[PDB]
Amino acid sequence: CNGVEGFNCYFPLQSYGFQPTNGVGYQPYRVVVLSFAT
Amino acid sequence: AVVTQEPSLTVSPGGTVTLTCGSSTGAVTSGHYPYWFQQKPGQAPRTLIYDTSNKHSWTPARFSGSLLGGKAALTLSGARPEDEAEYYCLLSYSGARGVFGGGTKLTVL
Amino acid sequence: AVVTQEPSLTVSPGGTVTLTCGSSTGAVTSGHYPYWFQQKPGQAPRTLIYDTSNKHSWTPARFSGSLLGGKAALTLSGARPEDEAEYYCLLSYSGARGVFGGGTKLTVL
Amino acid sequence: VQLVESGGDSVQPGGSLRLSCAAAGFTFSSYWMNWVRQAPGKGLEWVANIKQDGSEKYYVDSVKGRFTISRDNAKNSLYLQMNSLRAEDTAVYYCALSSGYSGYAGNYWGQGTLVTVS
Amino acid sequence: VQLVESGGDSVQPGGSLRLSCAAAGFTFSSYWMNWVRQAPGKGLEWVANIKQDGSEKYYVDSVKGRFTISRDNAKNSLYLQMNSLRAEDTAVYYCALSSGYSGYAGNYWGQGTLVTVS
């Protein structure tokens, strides 16, 4: 896996297949987390 | 050692694509570990799909290395003008002596 | 969308029980919000455990909605003849399209 | 908290059947409404669901495109219509009320209605 | 991951030509090394392969007995020699690196070298 993509050597990132017709649970969702004096 | 493909496909921008490939005998399965390549004019062929369904890092995620009814395919979820290219398939057989299909030309309307 | 269970369990009166359930992929966690049901002959299924470990008011406290090594379970601290029933598990997945296991029959010796 | 389910009958394959469930003793439009079926001698099969406000529906893939759910919040009830019903689809259908975290699985169950296809 | 291929030139039919490919940016003796040719106006033709350690070689039947592959793991490169080269064999030859399950087909491609026979 020394710089060469192949079997058992995968690129670490994968995109989401977001489409308007892709059910409910496969739709894109916007998430904001507000993590907790000024 | 015969592999065939649909000679050409025309797709409207944003439309889907189904490019197909297969052997004259048996059926295409994961055991053929099918490969798909994309070639633009003046360029070397570039592998998009390897080992049936694994997609390369340089390949747009709009492309999908799916299989059909005993056939290999390279589909698109929405084609763009940038995708105009000749696409090629390669299947393995009894060993590492693969056979390429005739080539399937993809254009965008 | 595959869920499996141990087909049956036999427990002596006063003995403990470990009924198990799980998915063919990944592991069962609280994110599957697992449910367990009890069905006696002639009766509708009744939920005993919901959302992993919450027990219902009509469920004997001898029952416990615990998790095991990447699996759901319904255990007993001491089984009684009144508990003879078919038990079922249900897991959530990508959405509210849950899958039931094959069913685990509990009898008392 | 009572769930009253009916509509099961003896029907012919290739046809359709509409089942229904009425809520009593609780508010309908505050919970998710589930459908589960059980063939005699078999375990439970997940069939379908519907969100509290009817904006979302869920089906087990095996009935997708054949089963439809609709509801009337003013009557505290829901309907499940199954088209192209198969001879193999002999089962007791059950209405269940989901008050859990996701609304995906029921806590309270009705008595069930028997659907026989011949 | 670069594949540098050369050796293509204008040659006469009935003679022979040795092509070569050098690896850069990656380990040579961990992957299979492929050869593919493309006649202008035509699709891709599979020509040959060689196993990671050189113990096995593969050819398309059409070049069997004419094409030979050898390699030097200390130079990170391989050579393809084609004997009894035909006038019909006008094509760009490409070097490709196979890191896949079987090693039969390449993932990475070089720019190619043109072989013209007249």
- B58 to each of A5, B38, B49, B54, how far by Cα in Å? 10, 11, 10, 12
CA distance C33 to C73: 12
Q: Which phi-psi region, left, alpha or beta, contains residue E75 (left: φ > 0; alpha: ψ -120 to 50)?
A: alpha
Query: Between A and C, how many CB-CB pairs are < 8 A?
Result: 5
Helices (H), E1-118: none
CA distance D29 to D34: 13
Q: Quick one: three-class SS letters along chain D?
A: CEEEEECCCEECCCCCEEEEEEEECCCCCCCEEEEEEECCCCCEEEEEEECCCCCCEEECHHHCCCEEEEEECCCCEEEEEECCCCCCCCEEEEEEEECCCCCCCCCEECCCEEEEEC
| Side-chain-side CA neighbours of residue A35 (13 Å) | 2
Find, among B81, B106, B93, the residue nearest to B34 by Cα. B93
CA distance B71 to E59: 24
Which residues in chain B touch residue A11, judged by CB atoms under 8 angstroms apart?
56-57
Which residues in chain A touch residue B50, judged by CB atoms under 8 angstroms apart?
6-7
Q: Which two tokens stand for residue E94?
A: 């490409």
Which chain A residue is nearest to residue B63, measuring alpha carbons? A17
Helix (H, G, I), strand (E, B) or coil at E63: helix
CA distance B23 to E72: 35
| Side-chain-side CA neighbours of residue D16 (13 Å) | 10
C94 inside 8 A of chain A by CB: yes
Amino acid at position B94, single letter: S
CATH of the domain at D71: 2.60.40.10
Indicate yes or no: CB of B77 within 8 angstroms of CB of A10. Answer: no
Give the one of E45, E51, E110 whose C-beta lies nearest to B100's C-beta.
Answer: E45
Find, among E46, E20, E32, the residue nearest to E108 by Cα. E32
Q: Which two tokens stand for residue C96?
A: 């509210």
CA distance B24 to B81: 32
CATH of the domain at C58: 2.60.40.10
Indicate yes or no: CB of E26 within 8 angstroms of CB of A7. Answer: no
Q: Is E97 exposed, middle or buried (0-12, 13-18, 19+ CB in 10 A)?
A: buried
How far away is chain B from the Cα of E100, in angstroms, using its nearest Cα?
A: 7
Give the number of domains in chain B: 1
Residue indicated by tokens 């009924």: C19
Strands (E), chain B: 3-5, 8-11, 17-23, 35-39, 46-50, 54-55, 63-64, 72-76, 85-91, 99-100, 104-108
C48 Cβ contact list (under 8 Å, min separation 6)? C36, C37, C38, C55, C56, C59, C63, C65, C74
Which residues in chain B touch residue A6, judged by CB atoms under 8 angstroms apart?
50
How far away is chain E from the Cα of A17, in angstroms, using its nearest Cα?
A: 24
Using CB atoms, which chains have 3+ pairs under 8 A with B? A, E
Domain coverage including residue D75 = 2-117
How far away is chain A from the Cα of E34, in angstroms, using its nearest Cα?
A: 15
How far away is chain C from the Cα of D61, in angstroms, using its nearest Cα?
A: 8
A11 inside 8 A of chain B by CB: yes
Domain coverage including residue B63 = 3-108
Indicate yes or no: CB of B1 within 8 angstroms of CB of E61. Answer: yes
CA distance E69 to E80: 5
Find, among E63, E56, E52, the residue nearest to E19 by Cα. E63
Which residues in chain E touch residue B30, judged by CB atoms under 8 angstroms apart?
none
How far away is chain B from the Cα of E53, in angstroms, using its nearest Cα?
A: 15
CA distance A28 to A18: 6
Query: In E, what residues contact A, Cβ < 8 A?
Result: 1, 25-27, 30-31, 97-101, 107-108
Find, among D21, D72, D25, the residue nearest to D47 by Cα. D21
Which chain B residue is nearest to residue E97, measuring alpha carbons? B47
Using what technique was this structure determined? cryo-EM
CA distance C95 to A25: 5
| Side-chain-side CA neighbours of residue C11 (13 Å) | 24
Give the number of domains in chain E: 1
Q: Report yes or no on chains D and E touching (3+ CB pairs under 8 A).
A: no
E14 inside 8 A of chain B by CB: no
Amino acid at position E88, single letter: E
CA distance B41 to B46: 12
Phi then psi dihedrals of residue C72, to 5 deg? -85, 150
Using CB atoms, which chains have 3+ pairs under 8 A with D? C
| Side-chain-side CA neighbours of residue B37 (13 Å) | 25
Pairing of strands C8-11, C104-108: parallel
Widest CA span of chain B, in angstroms? 40
Strands (E), E1-118: 2-6, 10-11, 17-24, 32-38, 45-50, 57-59, 67-72, 77-82, 91-98, 108-109, 113-117
Q: Which phi-psi region, left, alpha or beta, contains residue C52 (left: φ > 0; alpha: ψ -120 to 50)?
A: left
